[PDB]
Design a protein around this nucleic acid. Sequence first.
DNA 1: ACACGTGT
DNA 2: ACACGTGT
Length: 8
Amino acid sequence: XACXXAXX
DNA sequence: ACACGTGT
DNA sequence: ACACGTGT
Ligand SMILES: *C(=O)c1nc2ccccc2cc1O
Ligand SMILES: *C(=O)c1nc2ccccc2cc1O
């Protein structure tokens, strides 16, 4: 759920 | 059980 | 070495 490198 | 990678 | 959780 978070996006810090991908954002799922 | 499956779904994540770029940005220091 | 540190930096992540919402949504099926
Ligand atoms: C988002 O909350 C979240 N995203 C994920 C992406 C890929 C793998 C695990 C994973 C867990 C969570 O909680
Ligand atoms: C992004 O590429 C990315 N983000 C993260 C966030 C939190 C923890 C690990 C992590 C690894 C990567 O690759």
